[PDB]
Design a protein around this nucleic acid. Structure first.
Ligand SMILES: [Mg+2]
Lengths: 302, 178
DNA sequence: TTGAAGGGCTTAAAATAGGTGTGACAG
DNA sequence: CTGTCACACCTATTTTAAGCCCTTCAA
């Protein structure tokens, strides 16, 4: 019956309709918001938390049905702070005692890759940049699965991985005419925002494909680089399972492990402290201002 | 069969009651190592060079000591802040000293499939890579929270005694290994 | 253009505490 | 229509982890 609860339930329904979700999703998300509101910790929360809670309840519903809604996308639609969304989501999952399924990368690849406006020519999309939607989706998914198998996805934001993989799939489908286009120019013509980590993900994925190329004698002899490896991506993906097992068999690790050279280990000092040693007057007096220091400070504040 | 890995203590949080009311303006004006911005935060921020630590001193006489690397260092530093406050003219006492929190860290030196760990140990695990790179593991015995990273680096926190950090690490090591 | 490098945030724990947001109570 | 009541939850302190995201600067 609460004015902020009524407003919240109405906002939950409006978010589901804006997102064009199946009809059953609305009811489930409304029930989660109601369940949340029964807890005193939620009832006494800031109106800003009650606003993002709308998004948490819809996201939980979408995660249970493998609907690939990202936390970033919800916060953009709700004009909400991601950090407030983060703390509210973690709280409500813990409070409702839920085992929320992880984001479905396979379904995100389909939805996100289809938003890239590269399927029809236009003044900003020339003929040689136009690609088949099915060929695009299939190769992007294979490159996302490769990134996941070669430790590039664990602990990272998942969307920039798909941005890097979509760009590489697009270039490898017509390498002669698409290697002059950078990641930034590609996102701009496809009309998609460029995620900040996407350039790092691209360089990691190119280095992984270069290590795989070392497992094939006829590719190893070509002394490939991050530019020349692109025309052989089709060939490498054809044998991705075999090439990955061969690369691990002969060091393939998460990028944060290989390597951290700038590290200091001699900073810790040996400790012989008991906590019971005498504390002399001279040891303490050094932390006190002198009568002159006090006067000079007082005059400067007057 | 121990791991042969000993977690390193990184930070100790302790509290003590100086048992008397304090004028924070007087402490800020007469100490050298005091930082006081009441419009920003209601307590004095005090620092000593040895043991290298920071104290939060409240007008109620209560104090929080942070940054020590051993429970002994935390006690010695807490006694030094109490002695600074006494020399400033207050009848400060050293009452109810208590270690409140301990943070440990170590490395198992092999990668961890966090996406797999969150499935096999779901009832203790939380892993949301859109929000944080590490898996949050809430162990019940001992009651310790561990942050587990893809690198094999582990952060242990919430301990009241050193043994709880060591116990939690010996418990998690076979889970991570197999 | 495109990177590196450095600062400051996210997550976990824990105490300290005033001021004030927030909603359901009594009166 | 106020007072009480019981929560939230901002500012801040420490410390590790790895990622993000921004400004800043270099050939
Ligand atoms: Mg906290």
């Amino acid at each position: 019956v609460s004015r902020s609860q009524q407003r919240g339930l109405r906002r939950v329904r409006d978010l589901c309709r804006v997102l064009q979700l199946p009809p059953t999703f609305e009811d489930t998300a409304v029930a989660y918001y109601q369940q949340a509101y029964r807890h005193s910790g939620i009832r006494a929360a800031r109106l800003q938390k009650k606003e993002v809670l709308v998004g948490c309840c819809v996201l939980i519903t979408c995660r249970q049905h493998n609907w690939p809604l990202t936390m970033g996308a919800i916060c953009t639609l709700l004009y909400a702070d991601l950090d407030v969304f983060s703390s509210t989501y973690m709280q409500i999952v813990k409070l409702l005692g839920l085992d929320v399924p992880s984001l479905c990368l396979a379904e995100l690849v389909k939805t996100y890759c289809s938003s890239f406006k590269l399927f029809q020519a236009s003044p900003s999309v020339p003929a040689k940049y136009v690609e088949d939607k099915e060929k695009m989706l299939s190769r992007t998914m294979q490159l996302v699965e490769l990134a996941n198998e070669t430790w590039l996805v664990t602990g990272r934001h998942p969307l920039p991985v798909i941005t890097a993989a979509t760009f590489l799939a697009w270039q490898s489908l017509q390498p002669a005419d698409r290697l002059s286009c950078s990641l930034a120019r590609f996102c701009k013509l496809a009309n998609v925002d460029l995620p900040y980590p996407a350039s790092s993900r691209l360089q990691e994925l190119l280095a992984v494909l270069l290590r795989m190329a070392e497992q094939l004698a006829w590719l190893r002899v070509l002394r490939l680089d991050k530019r020349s490896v692109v025309k052989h991506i089709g060939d490498l993906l054809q044998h991705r399972q075999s090439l990955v097992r061969s690369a691990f068999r002969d060091l393939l690790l998460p990028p944060c492990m290989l390597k951290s050279p700038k590290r200091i280990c001699p900073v810790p000092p040996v400790s012989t402290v008991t906590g019971d040693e005498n504390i002399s007057d001279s040891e303490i007096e050094q932390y006190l201002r002198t009568p002159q220091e006090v006067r000079d400070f007082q005059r400067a504040q007057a | 069969g121990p791991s042969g890995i000993v977690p390193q203590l990184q930070n100790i949080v302790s509290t003590v009651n100086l048992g008397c009311k304090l004028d924070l303006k007087t402490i800020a004006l007469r100490a050298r190592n005091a930082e006081y911005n009441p419009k920003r935060f209601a307590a004095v921020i005090m620092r000593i060079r040895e043991p290298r630590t920071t104290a939060l001193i409240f007008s109620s006489g209560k104090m929080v000591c942070t940054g020590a690397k051993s429970e002994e260092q935390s006690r010695l530093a807490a006694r030094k802040y109490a002695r600074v406050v006494q020399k400033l003219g207050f009848p400060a006492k050293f009452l109810d000293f208590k270690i409140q929190n301990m943070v440990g860290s170590c490395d198992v030196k092999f990668p961890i499939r966090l996406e797999g760990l969150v499935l096999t140990h779901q009832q203790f695990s939380s892993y949301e890579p859109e929000l944080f790179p590490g898996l949050i593991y809430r162990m019940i015995k001992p009651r310790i929270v561990l942050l587990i990273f893809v690198s094999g680096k582990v952060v242990l926190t919430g301990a009241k005694v050193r043994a709880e950090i060591y116990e939690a690490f010996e418990n998690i090591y076979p889970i991570l290994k197999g």
